[PDB]
Design an enzyme around this catalytic site. Structure first.
Site, PDB file in Angstrom:
ATOM      1  N   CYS A  79       9.012   2.856  10.255  1.00 31.49           N
ATOM      2  CA  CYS A  79      10.019   1.941   9.701  1.00 31.49           C
ATOM      3  C   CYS A  79      11.146   2.714   9.008  1.00 31.49           C
ATOM      4  N   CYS A 108      12.771  -0.125  11.003  1.00 26.10           N
ATOM      5  CA  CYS A 108      13.490  -1.220  10.340  1.00 26.10           C
ATOM      6  C   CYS A 108      14.727  -0.743   9.587  1.00 26.10           C
ATOM      7  N   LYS A 142      17.709   0.684  11.907  1.00 22.93           N
ATOM      8  CA  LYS A 142      18.212  -0.344  12.816  1.00 22.93           C
ATOM      9  C   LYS A 142      18.933  -1.472  12.065  1.00 22.93           C
ATOM     10  N   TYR A 148      12.043  -7.095  21.000  1.00 25.69           N
ATOM     11  CA  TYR A 148      13.012  -7.192  19.919  1.00 25.69           C
ATOM     12  C   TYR A 148      13.705  -5.851  19.694  1.00 25.69           C
ATOM     13  N   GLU A 196      17.695  -5.744  19.867  1.00 20.04           N
ATOM     14  CA  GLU A 196      18.389  -5.398  18.630  1.00 20.04           C
ATOM     15  C   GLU A 196      19.308  -4.202  18.849  1.00 20.04           C
ATOM     16  N   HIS A 248      23.957 -26.999  -1.663  1.00 22.25           N
ATOM     17  CA  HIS A 248      25.217 -27.143  -0.911  1.00 22.25           C
ATOM     18  C   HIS A 248      26.325 -26.249  -1.480  1.00 22.25           C
ATOM     19  N   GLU A 252      20.144 -25.466   3.843  1.00 22.23           N
ATOM     20  CA  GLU A 252      19.910 -26.857   3.447  1.00 22.23           C
ATOM     21  C   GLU A 252      19.684 -27.790   4.638  1.00 22.23           C
TER      22      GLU A 252
HETATM   23  C1  LIG Z   1      12.738   0.274  16.347  1.00 24.21           C
HETATM   24  C2  LIG Z   1      11.752  -0.421  15.440  1.00 24.21           C
HETATM   25  C3  LIG Z   1      12.203  -1.381  14.533  1.00 24.21           C
HETATM   26  C4  LIG Z   1      11.315  -2.037  13.675  1.00 24.21           C
HETATM   27  N1  LIG Z   1      11.815  -2.981  12.785  1.00 24.21           N
HETATM   28  C5  LIG Z   1      10.968  -3.586  11.985  1.00 24.21           C
HETATM   29  C6  LIG Z   1      11.489  -4.585  11.063  1.00 24.21           C
HETATM   30  O1  LIG Z   1      12.675  -4.917  10.949  1.00 24.21           O
HETATM   31  N2  LIG Z   1      10.504  -5.166  10.249  1.00 24.21           N
HETATM   32  C7  LIG Z   1       9.138  -4.874  10.274  1.00 24.21           C
HETATM   33  O2  LIG Z   1       8.380  -5.467   9.496  1.00 24.21           O
HETATM   34  N3  LIG Z   1       8.667  -3.944  11.157  1.00 24.21           N
HETATM   35  C8  LIG Z   1       9.549  -3.338  11.966  1.00 24.21           C
HETATM   36  N4  LIG Z   1       9.074  -2.394  12.852  1.00 24.21           N
HETATM   37  C9  LIG Z   1       7.627  -2.122  12.860  1.00 24.21           C
HETATM   38  C10 LIG Z   1       7.208  -1.132  11.788  1.00 24.21           C
HETATM   39  O3  LIG Z   1       7.860   0.112  12.046  1.00 24.21           O
HETATM   40  C11 LIG Z   1       5.694  -0.926  11.856  1.00 24.21           C
HETATM   41  O4  LIG Z   1       5.012  -2.179  11.848  1.00 24.21           O
HETATM   42  C12 LIG Z   1       5.153  -0.064  10.715  1.00 24.21           C
HETATM   43  O5  LIG Z   1       6.012   1.061  10.499  1.00 24.21           O
HETATM   44  C13 LIG Z   1       3.742   0.397  11.020  1.00 24.21           C
HETATM   45  O6  LIG Z   1       3.230   1.136   9.893  1.00 24.21           O
HETATM   46  P1  LIG Z   1       1.929   2.015  10.035  1.00 24.21           P
HETATM   47  O7  LIG Z   1       1.530   2.479   8.630  1.00 24.21           O
HETATM   48  O8  LIG Z   1       0.911   1.240  10.840  1.00 24.21           O
HETATM   49  O9  LIG Z   1       2.440   3.300  10.906  1.00 24.21           O
HETATM   50  P2  LIG Z   1       3.749   4.204  10.869  1.00 24.21           P
HETATM   51  O10 LIG Z   1       4.766   3.598   9.971  1.00 24.21           O
HETATM   52  O11 LIG Z   1       4.173   4.476  12.323  1.00 24.21           O
HETATM   53  O12 LIG Z   1       3.248   5.600  10.273  1.00 24.21           O
HETATM   54  C14 LIG Z   1       2.178   6.349  10.890  1.00 24.21           C
HETATM   55  C15 LIG Z   1       2.423   7.801  10.549  1.00 24.21           C
HETATM   56  O13 LIG Z   1       1.256   8.604  10.874  1.00 24.21           O
HETATM   57  C16 LIG Z   1       1.703   9.774  11.523  1.00 24.21           C
HETATM   58  N5  LIG Z   1       0.605  10.352  12.297  1.00 24.21           N
HETATM   59  C17 LIG Z   1       0.223  10.030  13.575  1.00 24.21           C
HETATM   60  N6  LIG Z   1      -0.798  10.727  14.020  1.00 24.21           N
HETATM   61  C18 LIG Z   1      -1.106  11.571  12.963  1.00 24.21           C
HETATM   62  C19 LIG Z   1      -2.093  12.561  12.790  1.00 24.21           C
HETATM   63  N7  LIG Z   1      -2.990  12.881  13.728  1.00 24.21           N
HETATM   64  N8  LIG Z   1      -2.126  13.225  11.605  1.00 24.21           N
HETATM   65  C20 LIG Z   1      -1.232  12.905  10.664  1.00 24.21           C
HETATM   66  N9  LIG Z   1      -0.258  11.992  10.714  1.00 24.21           N
HETATM   67  C21 LIG Z   1      -0.246  11.352  11.893  1.00 24.21           C
HETATM   68  C22 LIG Z   1       2.906   9.315  12.338  1.00 24.21           C
HETATM   69  O14 LIG Z   1       3.680  10.417  12.794  1.00 24.21           O
HETATM   70  C23 LIG Z   1       3.604   8.445  11.285  1.00 24.21           C
HETATM   71  O15 LIG Z   1       4.409   9.211  10.388  1.00 24.21           O
HETATM   72  C24 LIG Z   1       9.950  -1.709  13.722  1.00 24.21           C
HETATM   73  C25 LIG Z   1       9.497  -0.751  14.629  1.00 24.21           C
HETATM   74  C26 LIG Z   1      10.383  -0.107  15.487  1.00 24.21           C
HETATM   75  C27 LIG Z   1       9.870   0.937  16.447  1.00 24.21           C
HETATM   76  C1  LIG Z   2      35.331 -27.540  -8.350  1.00 26.69           C
HETATM   77  C2  LIG Z   2      34.015 -28.186  -8.009  1.00 26.69           C
HETATM   78  C3  LIG Z   2      33.077 -27.488  -7.246  1.00 26.69           C
HETATM   79  C4  LIG Z   2      31.845 -28.064  -6.916  1.00 26.69           C
HETATM   80  N1  LIG Z   2      30.939 -27.333  -6.141  1.00 26.69           N
HETATM   81  C5  LIG Z   2      29.793 -27.890  -5.844  1.00 26.69           C
HETATM   82  C6  LIG Z   2      28.844 -27.126  -5.045  1.00 26.69           C
HETATM   83  O1  LIG Z   2      29.014 -25.983  -4.607  1.00 26.69           O
HETATM   84  N2  LIG Z   2      27.660 -27.812  -4.777  1.00 26.69           N
HETATM   85  C7  LIG Z   2      27.337 -29.104  -5.203  1.00 26.69           C
HETATM   86  O2  LIG Z   2      26.239 -29.592  -4.886  1.00 26.69           O
HETATM   87  N3  LIG Z   2      28.235 -29.802  -5.957  1.00 26.69           N
HETATM   88  C8  LIG Z   2      29.398 -29.213  -6.262  1.00 26.69           C
HETATM   89  N4  LIG Z   2      30.307 -29.924  -7.015  1.00 26.69           N
HETATM   90  C9  LIG Z   2      29.939 -31.279  -7.457  1.00 26.69           C
HETATM   91  C10 LIG Z   2      30.136 -32.329  -6.372  1.00 26.69           C
HETATM   92  O3  LIG Z   2      31.485 -32.288  -5.903  1.00 26.69           O
HETATM   93  C11 LIG Z   2      29.852 -33.712  -6.957  1.00 26.69           C
HETATM   94  O4  LIG Z   2      28.571 -33.697  -7.576  1.00 26.69           O
HETATM   95  C12 LIG Z   2      29.926 -34.847  -5.931  1.00 26.69           C
HETATM   96  O5  LIG Z   2      31.148 -34.747  -5.188  1.00 26.69           O
HETATM   97  C13 LIG Z   2      29.811 -36.202  -6.599  1.00 26.69           C
HETATM   98  O6  LIG Z   2      29.797 -37.229  -5.586  1.00 26.69           O
HETATM   99  P1  LIG Z   2      30.064 -38.739  -5.957  1.00 26.69           P
HETATM  100  O7  LIG Z   2      29.793 -39.575  -4.701  1.00 26.69           O
HETATM  101  O8  LIG Z   2      29.275 -39.056  -7.178  1.00 26.69           O
HETATM  102  O9  LIG Z   2      31.656 -38.802  -6.303  1.00 26.69           O
HETATM  103  P2  LIG Z   2      32.961 -38.131  -5.684  1.00 26.69           P
HETATM  104  O10 LIG Z   2      32.587 -37.097  -4.668  1.00 26.69           O
HETATM  105  O11 LIG Z   2      33.851 -37.636  -6.842  1.00 26.69           O
HETATM  106  O12 LIG Z   2      33.732 -39.357  -4.994  1.00 26.69           O
HETATM  107  C14 LIG Z   2      34.097 -40.541  -5.739  1.00 26.69           C
HETATM  108  C15 LIG Z   2      35.306 -41.129  -5.045  1.00 26.69           C
HETATM  109  O13 LIG Z   2      35.627 -42.439  -5.583  1.00 26.69           O
HETATM  110  C16 LIG Z   2      37.019 -42.493  -5.815  1.00 26.69           C
HETATM  111  N5  LIG Z   2      37.305 -43.529  -6.806  1.00 26.69           N
HETATM  112  C17 LIG Z   2      37.274 -43.414  -8.173  1.00 26.69           C
HETATM  113  N6  LIG Z   2      37.578 -44.523  -8.808  1.00 26.69           N
HETATM  114  C18 LIG Z   2      37.831 -45.429  -7.787  1.00 26.69           C
HETATM  115  C19 LIG Z   2      38.181 -46.795  -7.792  1.00 26.69           C
HETATM  116  N7  LIG Z   2      38.362 -47.509  -8.908  1.00 26.69           N
HETATM  117  N8  LIG Z   2      38.340 -47.412  -6.592  1.00 26.69           N
HETATM  118  C20 LIG Z   2      38.159 -46.700  -5.476  1.00 26.69           C
HETATM  119  N9  LIG Z   2      37.820 -45.412  -5.350  1.00 26.69           N
HETATM  120  C21 LIG Z   2      37.661 -44.831  -6.548  1.00 26.69           C
HETATM  121  C22 LIG Z   2      37.383 -41.076  -6.222  1.00 26.69           C
HETATM  122  O14 LIG Z   2      38.795 -40.933  -6.136  1.00 26.69           O
HETATM  123  C23 LIG Z   2      36.584 -40.301  -5.166  1.00 26.69           C
HETATM  124  O15 LIG Z   2      37.216 -40.273  -3.888  1.00 26.69           O
HETATM  125  C24 LIG Z   2      31.561 -29.366  -7.356  1.00 26.69           C
HETATM  126  C25 LIG Z   2      32.492 -30.059  -8.124  1.00 26.69           C
HETATM  127  C26 LIG Z   2      33.715 -29.483  -8.454  1.00 26.69           C
HETATM  128  C27 LIG Z   2      34.707 -30.267  -9.273  1.00 26.69           C
END
Ligand SMILES: Cc1cc2nc3c(=O)[nH]c(=O)nc-3n(C[C@H](O)[C@H](O)[C@H](O)COP(=O)(O)OP(=O)(O)OC[C@H]3O[C@@H](n4cnc5c(N)ncnc54)[C@H](O)[C@@H]3O)c2cc1C
Ligand SMILES: Cc1cc2nc3c(=O)[nH]c(=O)nc-3n(C[C@H](O)[C@H](O)[C@H](O)COP(=O)(O)OP(=O)(O)OC[C@H]3O[C@@H](n4cnc5c(N)ncnc54)[C@H](O)[C@@H]3O)c2cc1C
Ligand SMILES: CC(C)c1ccc(C(=O)Nc2ccccn2)cc1
Ligand SMILES: CC(C)c1ccc(C(=O)Nc2ccccn2)cc1
Ligand SMILES: CC(C)c1ccc(C(=O)Nc2ccccn2)cc1
Ligand SMILES: CC(C)c1ccc(C(=O)Nc2ccccn2)cc1
Lengths: 587, 586
Positions: free
Chosen positions: B149, B154, B157, B291, B295, B564, B569
């Site tokens: 790895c 891992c 890559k 994979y 990859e 959101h 979500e």
């Molecule tokens: C290209 C690639 C990408 C991967 N990407 C991921 C990923 O994103 N996520 C993930 O979870 N897994 C990934 N894997 C898998 C991951 O590499 C293995 O699951 C993990 O490394 C296995 O661990 P291990 O301890 O079983 O053996 P290893 O990590 O292979 O280590 C065994 C070691 O023992 C040594 N050895 C061998 N024979 C002897 C000996 N006789 N005496 C002494 N030392 C010896 C070897 O040379 C080596 O250094 C990937 C594998 C590859 C090939």
């Molecule tokens: C800058 C900012 C960033 C935010 N970012 C996030 C975020 O990342 N994630 C998240 O979950 N929430 C976020 N929020 C909160 C989210 O926008 C509110 O919780 C949500 O929009 C409330 O929904 P509502 O239906 O209660 O009212 P609103 O979405 O405010 O809608 C009420 C509507 O009724 C209208 N209205 C009011 N009075 C009247 C009336 N008398 N007659 C007719 N229409 C009327 C208003 O003009 C409006 O159009 C953010 C809020 C702000 C201000």
């Protein structure tokens, strides 16, 4: 129990068929309703725990115990023979459309929760209207359908955040072997705003098309509830009229507050204005320290602005304060200035140059918490000092809807107000997390209970959040301080660790800046009470753990689950350093 | 029950103290043990439910029922008074170092699993040796401590994957308003490999420091188990000698396979060679469909390579095939060419230009399964046709360690081989997912059971994965076709949806990202598998693996609220079923 459910379902459903999947007489009735384009809710009795009991109770309404049975607005209409008779004699359309009110449902407010409620209700045959009106800001900014998140909230702020994130991608690319020179690249604000606004416009249009295609009447009009079933609307020519509805959902949201000081409303702006600002803000003062304040200050600085944040007391009041300080420290080290323990007392020096597309110039005077003085010039001042509803615009006090001390609607756990046919959802529902996915769930689940006989309530507990500051911060559950206060220090164990993204190694970014912790309860099998992560893609990391936390995850559950390598998130599956131990969390 | 546990724990612990947190006599013994720098395991009997029973059972070994009691390698040493006596009289150091063997633990293999095992064992007082040797590739490539790895897996890559991802971030930048011109920017391969290799070297060094600081003997030698307790070593001067150990952990990993055709070993390479190659591969043929194959082909294409993948039958055999095809379709639309249903029958046209830092040139001839002919020129041919151990280089047949048909070690669920003191972890443990976090968990839990009396077993079920193709693919649990075979189509319900990252809107595809939950109807709609194709798929997937471990149902996904705006979500509001026939587009 079954009796009271059946009575509730029948009285409020607009058009509902009690059926069985096996019965061909039901199939024959469904096909007739489909051909006449009559939408309705359907309850398949051969698929419920006590469908046999419901079948008997239906007799109290219809004097018959058999299936199908069709009801309209609380009234038994007929069995298979009787409905086909109405269809043959062209009497069906008048039967299903006659109602004491203009609409089965009026939604006041066309935003996150309101549009969700309205679309879902119409799916089950409820005749629905959605009212939306956007009162312009003090400088005149306005926008289209969809609410705060779509137009001046989550959507544009996360898009501008992405634009800020791309600045560091550009720096990172040189170390990964790409030939660009980050030092010779600049950013064009108005080009970014144009793309953001074009996406928002496509969402305004999408919502209007969704409403049409669901047979929902959209009225761009300001609505005001004057009696339990009467809504007074005012259209764009100031024409006034009255429409009536059985059920009413208040979904009107909030707007930004201004501090009560001279110059604020005249010369400053808020986030309402920022997302379509035609000029780059320039040297900017952000007043406030909410997540809105910090998110905006964060991307403005990444897009090359000279940014200062004025903080009255603390950052991110109500969030875990250790995490909040780590968030702020990162921003301060990557070029945001802070004026701490400071409040404003605004003078205009230059008017906005609306010709040549340039900001004005302002003078800000304020004072620190010990008495020393603040005085400095800025081209733009943004206020982010909270948000509030103004339900006196929306709802006449004679109607009888109880409000709390902050102005929010007091509801029962099914969103019912003190007036039996009026409900409230979203940011105006008192005591609930003010978030877009919350309002959408509330509205969709309410509509189903009102018009389809559903029983499921919205669960408002342990809803996860993410603050999209330059280094993002995700959380689910209790802050550390809240857990200690609730249970006592002796019963709280906290596991934590720094980490470094593999992507940061070749780019030569910081070793011990990303951080995570689990706050756990000793006496409850080391239950995970709160999860906290500061790092890239924090919302993607956090989301899935919210399902586990909803289900009562303990530390042993995190331990027995294996990590995905290489990821930031996997650090949660091997945590072992405790705060009590005193051992360092660095890597 | 308790008594069999105590006997097993006392027999194999190197140095262990039975103790009580409240007892000052125990604290007095603890205080002496280090200062003399004696590492040891500790068991606090007042923290265990059946501590009263364990205290009684100790008397079967020491003829006393009190605490503290200190043991060394299966033998009772004494209480407080007796230990202090040994301490004052300069006799304690000799007691704790007395052993029938040179080491309490010999780990053969210095990789993900073996390094993890050895460090953890040394924490509890086991005298420990770790052996690592890297047999060079056919062209001579070798590397340092840390395993597959860290060096050729891992880590490099995913760093090259990130270099590929940055190409599209550079394009996206212009739409978000940055002034650069993507069409005038090129990639420098050698600059990238230099940075990757510098990070790898810092891992090599970090591991050598970690073993030093844990008092583990690191031997850069090749090891061979010649009897249950005897390990023959060969150092880098071909000097041969024999060390003995009580417990033995086999952790030697696998290496890449070559197909048996002319020119393969002589003129092609594997992933072992790719991650430190001094020249850009140029026009490249990747043979295989694992994979690893996808990859590598994927990032080579993002870095400006002319890439073809030659596919014998299907992509990603053993993964959900609908997800596999969506992965491949995306690669084909963004550059990668595919020679489908095709196998190789390699000619050298130019030798590698080592001086000018350039690849050579090769002629590849093969055939499609209908018999039509494949013939095409490439500068680099990368074989990715699987991996295999070679235990007849680690393990004498006479020792008695049983192997399966694939040459991997047959193990009990506590990693024990057919020889009572010999264990196996990592890729060579037959039937286990071959992943780095699994090997690490297996080694750490094994060390605790051998030397600290732990009982916890490694849980190998529903381990999540992520394939880091240009559009990433994360999964946890059963594929859809596996769920249906096991339970029947009528008991399986699939919820699914396309989605679009918000970051893709301003940058201008609408319906390429995809996710589904495969659920079992008759078990309360239990989630049997989760699948997602999209950016940051590994971050998306990880957290749901805890909920799936716990038995999540669709109702649990439904009642949890989204964050959101995120890609993740979309899992919380799924509702379109495959049986409905409704479109999953958005
Ligand atoms: C290209 C690639 C990408 C991967 N990407 C991921 C990923 O994103 N996520 C993930 O979870 N897994 C990934 N894997 C898998 C991951 O590499 C293995 O699951 C993990 O490394 C296995 O661990 P291990 O301890 O079983 O053996 P290893 O990590 O292979 O280590 C065994 C070691 O023992 C040594 N050895 C061998 N024979 C002897 C000996 N006789 N005496 C002494 N030392 C010896 C070897 O040379 C080596 O250094 C990937 C594998 C590859 C090939
Ligand atoms: C800058 C900012 C960033 C935010 N970012 C996030 C975020 O990342 N994630 C998240 O979950 N929430 C976020 N929020 C909160 C989210 O926008 C509110 O919780 C949500 O929009 C409330 O929904 P509502 O239906 O209660 O009212 P609103 O979405 O405010 O809608 C009420 C509507 O009724 C209208 N209205 C009011 N009075 C009247 C009336 N008398 N007659 C007719 N229409 C009327 C208003 O003009 C409006 O159009 C953010 C809020 C702000 C201000
Ligand atoms: C009582 C006061 C708040 C009021 C004043 C004017 C209006 C108005 O002009 N409405 C409208 C509707 C849609 C689009 C444009 N304008 C409504 C209410
Ligand atoms: C004080 C320091 C943090 C600072 C940060 C950024 C800048 C900058 O490059 N731009 C800028 C400045 C004013 C108005 C608009 N943009 C200048 C100073
Ligand atoms: C450079 C250093 C790591 C080293 C190099 C070579 C050997 C060695 O003599 N290996 C071996 C393998 C098979 C048959 C004979 N010898 C051990 C360590
Ligand atoms: C799709 C295929 C026809 C192709 C793809 C990429 C290129 C390219 O720009 N680079 C290149 C060429 C040779 C060796 C290495 N890189 C040429 C052809």
């Amino acid at each position: 129990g079954t009796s009271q459910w059946l009575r509730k379902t029948v009285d409020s459903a607009a058009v509902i068929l009690f059926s069985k999947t096996t019965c061909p007489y039901c199939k024959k009735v469904k096909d007739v309703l489909a051909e006449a384009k009559i939408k309705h809710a359907t309850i398949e009795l051969d698929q419920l725990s006590n469908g046999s009991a419901i079948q008997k109770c239906l007799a109290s309404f219809s004097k018959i115990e058999t299936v199908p049975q069709m009801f309209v607005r609380g009234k038994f209409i007929g069995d298979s023979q009787t409905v086909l008779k109405y269809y043959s004699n062209d009497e069906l359309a008048g039967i299903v459309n006659e109602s004491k009110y203009d609409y089965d449902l009026i939604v006041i407010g066309g935003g996150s929760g309101g549009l969700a409620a309205g679309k879902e209700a119409a799916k089950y045959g409820a005749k629905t209207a959605v009212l939306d009106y956007v009162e312009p800001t003090p400088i005149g900014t306005t926008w289209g359908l969809g609410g705060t998140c779509v137009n001046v909230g989550c959507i544009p702020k996360k898009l501008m955040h992405q634009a800020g994130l791309l600045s560091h991608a550009l720096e990172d690319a040189e170390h990964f072997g790409w030939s660009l020179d980050r030092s010779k690249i600049s950013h064009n604000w108005s080009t970014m705003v144009e793309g953001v606004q074009s996406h928002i416009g496509s969402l305004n249009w999408g919502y209007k098309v969704a409403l049409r295609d669901n047979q929902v009447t959209y009225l761009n009009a300001k609505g005001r509830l004057i009696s339990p079933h009467e809504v007074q609307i005012t259209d764009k020519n100031q024409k006034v009229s009255t429409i009536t509805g059985n059920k009413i959902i208040l979904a009107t949201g909030e707007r930004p507050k201004y501090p009560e000081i001279p110059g604020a409303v005249e010369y400053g702006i808020t986030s309402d204005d920022l997302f379509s600002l035609p000029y780059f803000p320039g040297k900017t003062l952000v007043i406030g320290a909410s997540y809105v304040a910090l998110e905006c200050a964060g991307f403005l600085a990444s897009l090359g602005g000279d940014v200062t944040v004025m903080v009255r007391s603390i950052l991110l009041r109500g969030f875990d304060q250790q995490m909040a300080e780590k968030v702020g420290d990162y921003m301060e080290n990557h070029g945001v200035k802070f004026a701490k323990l400071c409040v404003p007392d605004i003078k205009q020096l230059k008017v906005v140059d609306t010709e040549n597309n340039k900001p004005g110039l302002l003078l800000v005077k304020g004072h620190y918490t010990d008495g020393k003085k603040f005085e400095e010039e800025f081209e733009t001042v943004i206020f982010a000092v909270g948000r509030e509803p103004q339900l006196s615009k929306v709802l006449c006090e004679t109607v009888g809807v109880k409000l709390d001390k902050n102005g929010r609607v007091v509801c029962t756990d099914d969103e019912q107000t003190t007036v039996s046919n009026v409900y409230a959802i979203g940011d105006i529902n008192a005591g609930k997390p003010q978030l877009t996915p919350v309002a959408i769930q509330a509205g969709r689940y309410l509509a189903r209970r009102l018009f389809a006989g559903a029983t499921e309530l919205t669960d408002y507990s342990n809803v996860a959040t993410t603050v999209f500051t330059p280094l993002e911060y995700g959380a689910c559950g209790l802050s550390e301080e809240d857990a200690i206060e609730k249970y006592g220090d002796k019963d709280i164990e906290v596991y934590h660790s720094n980490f470094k993204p593999l992507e940061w190694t070749v780019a030569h970014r910081e070793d011990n800046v990303c951080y995570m912790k689990l706050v756990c309860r000793k006496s409850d099998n080391m239950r995970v009470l709160g999860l906290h992560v500061l790092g890239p893609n924090a919302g993607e990391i956090t989301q899935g753990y919210a399902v586990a936390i909803k289900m009562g995850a303990t530390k042993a559950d995190f331990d027995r689950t294996i990590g995905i390598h290489p990821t930031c998130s996997e650090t949660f599956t091997t945590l072992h350093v405790t705060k009590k131990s005193g051992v360092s969390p660095i890597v």
